[PDB]
RNA sequence: CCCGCACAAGCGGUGGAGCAUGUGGUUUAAUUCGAUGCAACGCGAAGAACCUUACCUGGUCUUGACAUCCACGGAAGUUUUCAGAGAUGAGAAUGUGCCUUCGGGAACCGUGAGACAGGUGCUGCAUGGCUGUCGUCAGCUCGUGUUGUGAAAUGUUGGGUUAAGUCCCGCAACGAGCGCAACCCUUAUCCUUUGUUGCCAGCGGUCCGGCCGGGAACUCAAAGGAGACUGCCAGUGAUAAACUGGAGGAAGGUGGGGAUGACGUCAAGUCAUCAUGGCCCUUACGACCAGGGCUACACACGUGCUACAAUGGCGCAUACAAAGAGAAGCGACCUCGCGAGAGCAAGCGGACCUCAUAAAGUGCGUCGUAGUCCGGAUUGGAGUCUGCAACUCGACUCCAUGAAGUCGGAAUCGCUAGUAAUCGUGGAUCAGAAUGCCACGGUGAAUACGUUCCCGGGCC
């Protein structure tokens, strides 16, 4: 139920429930459950508190949640402080990976700012 | 002994060998049920024999290459029809009336220059 | 067209050209096998809820959704008059089947087979959006009964 | 066995060239398998025909490569002599394999 | 195309022929799994020092009649425009207008 | 509208190719380029010899060039001396041993290229375009053309506004694929720029 | 004259439709119908036969133009017995004035005629051969009479100057003497030798046609 | 990125200018057009004046820059806003 | 009075979202040039990291990068060093050939003149050529004749009829030409011939694999034929053309699809493919180089792709294509890697080998209507490969991230059948770089009462 300082959904299959953790996608979720010897399709509600403790130990091997959030934040901060091209793109809120800005780039730019 | 018919439909060609028997149908070394999952495909194959009432009086040995499920079922139907008319020439008018004798000559129309497909034109804008 | 010039094959399970046409109306993207499975699933459910046969229970749903009359925008100077026209029998079925499918797609049940069985059972008892559209079409034809003869 | 593969862009040339090859071989105590008509390669080319723009204005061209296989079985020495002194039409590529 | 642009292509083809074997030998070392890190490093540095125009990727296929750098067809060695002109005069063997 | 090239559309139907060699992709572009250089050389060198058509064959490791000419004696020369000069140069260009054959054009008034070249020669010598066109048409029809069309386009008579003028006699059925339409073009390089000539000669069906 | 009115040369057309230029050859308006004056007719009919003899004894050509559904038969007999030429269906406008062109249709008929007899028809297809078969029949109805007539005519015997206004106008332009059966309802101006006559009754037509048959035949006899 | 089996790319001309600079302790900026060169550890402390298309932008190399290309620190496009 | 997806009847879209892409604009040192209503805007470009490249900044050259001629030295080359971003400059090794009348040569190099070269500089409104467009619309004309003082008319209008100035009939027209149709390619049926690399019906095997003897049947390959003509029949129609049915037939009324574009129109597009009159530059508007730019981003428009889910997502299992490409190429098998890939290394210039596995489908399971087990944008980290080189600015992979989006206002687009819709597959260009383009099959609809209306057009 409570893993990595968040409430994982009890009703969902374990493979999906563990993807509520920031830093656990489908692949890591499958690896955690494989390493714990828990089947993917077991609902979290159906697991014993012994099994939840094994899941906590497997999740602890990965960087997740606030630790991952701080790593990502630090990685962007590093770029922005360097003043490298990617850093400047982060600062300006423009695409960082070569994409066109003549059109699109709306994910980065946000909604259209009319003149 | 063995009455033959070639049948074709789209890009499929079927080789149908009909002998007196008890309603055996082999298609590419598989049963009709194994070869075609679709009941429409199975219906298409059985149509000629159901029409002439020889469903359990003939063994069919069929090979079929090319096209898809529906193409192959239609190729087979055309092949059975032609095999039946080699077996018994009086069946032609009944099979002709059912539409089974015709080689359905509808083929994929080629893609053309300036069109997205055969006829689908790119979207126009006034300006 | 300016110069006035296909034959549907009957469906495998039941031998109906009307149900073959129904599958075609339900079908999207050439996926006839998918459409066939939905219709035969829906008709099993419909035949189990009524005790009437699949085609018979289908015909009762069509009975209640088929329009007799509809309007046609027939422009005859100035404004355009909605003219009540008799719906010919093939178009009666066509509209009924289209409305049922349109209605079933709008419903909130899980699968289309269930949505469709519900709409067909609702059609049989005169309590769906398909029956409603027939009533809507009839009242607009009733409201423009003045403009027959056009 | 002498395998002769003939290629040409004209089928009338390739049919003349095979006719001569089956003639010379069958004269000279050889058993000729063929000519076998192997699949024609249709190589297609689509070009814009305007010097500028007009993307939908195009020509579609095709080079058909016709292909014939002749096999000379249990070839005589007279056979092999006569085949090499034949002179097929320019326009027919002749690949011999033994 | 300008005469100079045609001349640049001739230069690039000539250099690519001249250095082909040397470049291949250097890139074999750089690619090689079993080579030393020193030998791979030195080979990386050596491949830089060769003329850039010795790389085949520097060559642009140009129409052999006009020098046009766009619309090339490799079969003919010509731009689309010169293919069509030659095609219609019967100068490209086998080539005719296609329908199917 | 724009019209299909009359020669090109008839290429497997009633009209032969001018290059009749086979090649795989490896040699194909090289052969076209050598053919181009051979035709370029010969067209220039035999500008006064009334050359209609240069047919190129490549038998084995060689080139065979048939020069269709209205004036074969001038091409061949004095005991085949001039054609031997051509052969040596063609062999250098092609980079393979060359044979040059000379085919005679018996009727240069029915040869679209020679008619086109005749008109452009006259236009460069400031003959009135209408006179050149009319004689070309008259001569072809006298010598048994089933029809002829001549089109001349550009700054006719050194006019500022370019125009197209054409004359037709007889039938010139360009949509009939079995029609033996001899078609060719020429450019007159005048003091006011390029006048283009097009000649279509119909010589019956099939 | 007693036979002219037995034949019915006497009774002209109704008075409603008359041409006033034909009044000198109208004796009565008896019973709402103009009656042609035979005393004007017979002197004028014989001087027509006089000149037809003088033309036909110069050994020239007569063209029997009579293109109505009643005289088409007799003009195609009074020119065969006579050994002369006829037009018995639609006069093609420009037959004489555009003879240069219309002679090319004569030449095409003669090609098609040989093709029918030889059976180059049989060698060609159903579509092709039956098209040139029908083309033969169409050319024969129009130009069957004037096929063996490589030259503009020397006379133009006409029945009804009203119907053959085109033919007469053509003959007047080229300087060919017309010999028209000009009716009461018809213009005599262009005609050279006016024969005042009922131009419709088969029996009236046959009578004229036997006289012009003879006079030309007698021209050829001498 | 350049495959690890090939190692980091540096232009030989820059590599030798850096080696000379470090060996001499020369603190004059190294003028380069080699934007594509990887920043190596031995470049740390050098000013490298990297061409941006029209100017040589002084890049004082720090340890965090190692592994980046020099061109990353010399932006080539000038933009100050549309309504500026 | 007619026609055309013109409308109507339908089905699916666009317009809203994210992204791709083009354009405008703005910005910039430069964002190279061109295309601009339909008929510009995934257009020239069938593929901008460098190159390409035409632009910018800076570094450079001046008879020149690319020709011919002359003179004067030199074989050409191959090595290698320093400086330089490179262009290039300064060298140092090592050649000493090929024809030879033994005088010469002329191979390919400098170098010095100057006659010239050079120009993607300008004018598409000086042009050729090529192209778009009305429109594959059924038209447009001519000779001769005739009519009119004449511009002109007639033919070509009219009655029927046709997809069609198609055909018939009438007719001062008679004929003809260019268009229509046909001839061409492909597709649907059959026959003959040939039978490997394709094929396997019957045999004989057999390790179960057409695998091997064999067989030449069949599929198929591809040459040559046959076949469809309103030919036949009935009715209708003017004793017409034709039309409406019917038969037979694989196919039926132009069977389906393509190619094929009349006279002309828009001074339409292209002097940047090329060519070309004129003009202009000539130690520069030419030429070489490195780096940058063409990829910029308050924004507007066009064309697409991917979605928004349950007719679906995911997992597992498992069917059935066509077309095509390949030698500095396609690359199997095996091994290694989670994977992109890597390492070995067969085969194949191909009906043989390889790309290569079709996917939708089907079966079973799961999810249970949620911003989700929908979506997959964005961003972090780590990689792979091509390539001298992926910072600006590549594609791809892995882990993580998990945006907008709940079917889109006015308006607007495509499509009449193997079509639309949907599903994969291939190719050109190309080192690498497709959601574009061109092509290929699979599954496979709905609807058309009609011609009042909207748009374009034809005839009087
Ligand atoms: C697409 N568009 C913008 C127009 C458009 O819509 C259409 C259309 N038909 O729809 C068009 O015609 C156009 O495209 C077009 O092509 C044009 C020209 O050519 C042109 C031209 O060349 C000159 N030329 C000169 O006066 C040259 N000079 C002589 C003395 C010195 C200068 C003058 C001139 F007014 C024009 C008109 C344009 C109009 C243009
Ligand atoms: K997660
Ligand atoms: K960008
Ligand atoms: K032009
Ligand atoms: K006229
Ligand atoms: K110019
Ligand atoms: K760049
Ligand atoms: K796209
Ligand atoms: K869009
Ligand atoms: K999700
Ligand atoms: K890049
Ligand atoms: K939308
Ligand atoms: K590529
Ligand atoms: Mg990008
Ligand atoms: Mg398709
Ligand atoms: Mg497009
Ligand atoms: Mg191939
Ligand atoms: Mg040039
Ligand atoms: Mg390239
Ligand atoms: Mg990385
Ligand atoms: Mg509509
Ligand atoms: Mg949108
Ligand atoms: Mg632009
Ligand atoms: Mg312009
Ligand atoms: Mg320009
Ligand atoms: Mg305009
Ligand atoms: Mg560049
Ligand atoms: Mg250096
Ligand atoms: Mg110039
Ligand atoms: Mg223009
Ligand atoms: Mg007209
Ligand atoms: Mg016509
Ligand atoms: Mg054939
Ligand atoms: Mg029929
Ligand atoms: Mg046609
Ligand atoms: Mg203009
Ligand atoms: Mg550059
Ligand atoms: Mg661009
Ligand atoms: Mg998902
Ligand atoms: Mg490829
Ligand atoms: Mg592939
Ligand atoms: Mg599935
Ligand atoms: Mg249509
Ligand atoms: Mg697709
Ligand atoms: Mg019309």
Residue numbers in the entry:
A (entry chain M): 2 to 116
B (entry chain I): 4 to 130
C (entry chain G): 2 to 6, 10 to 154
D (entry chain J): 5 to 102
E (entry chain N): 2 to 101
F (entry chain C): 2 to 207
G (entry chain B): 6 to 227
H (entry chain S): 2 to 85
Give me lines lifted from the publication on this model.
The ribosome is a major target for clinically used antibiotics, but multidrug resistant pathogenic bacteria are making our current arsenal of antimicrobials obsolete. Here we present cryo-electron-microscopy structures of 17 distinct compounds from six different antibiotic classes bound to the bacterial ribosome at resolutions ranging from 1.6 to 2.2 Å. The improved resolution enables a precise description of antibiotic–ribosome interactions, encompassing solvent networks that mediate multiple additional interactions between the drugs and their target. To ensure homogeneity of the antibiotic–ribosome complexes, which is important for obtaining high resolution, we used highly purified in vitro reassociated Escherichia coli 70S ribosomes, to which each cocktail of antibiotics was added.
For the tetracycline family, we included one pentacycline that bears an additional ring E, as well as two clinically approved third generation glycylcyclines, eravacycline and omadacycline, which were developed in response to increasing tetracycline resistance, and differ from tetracycline by having extensions on the C9 position. In the structures of omadacycline and eravacycline in complex with the SSU head at 2.1 and 2.2 Å, an analogous interaction pattern was observed to that of tetracycline, consistent with the high similarity of the shared tetracyclic scaffold. The high structural conservation also encompassed the water-mediated interactions as well as the position of second-layer water molecules. However, despite conserved scaffolds, some variability is observed within the conformation around ring A, which influences how the Mg2 is coordinated. For omadacycline and pentacycline, the conformation allows direct coordination of Mg2 by the phosphate-oxygen(s) of G966, whereas for tetracycline and eravacycline, the Mg2–G966 coordination occurs indirectly via water molecules. A structural basis for these differences is not clear, suggesting that some conformational flexibility in this region is tolerated without affecting biological activity.
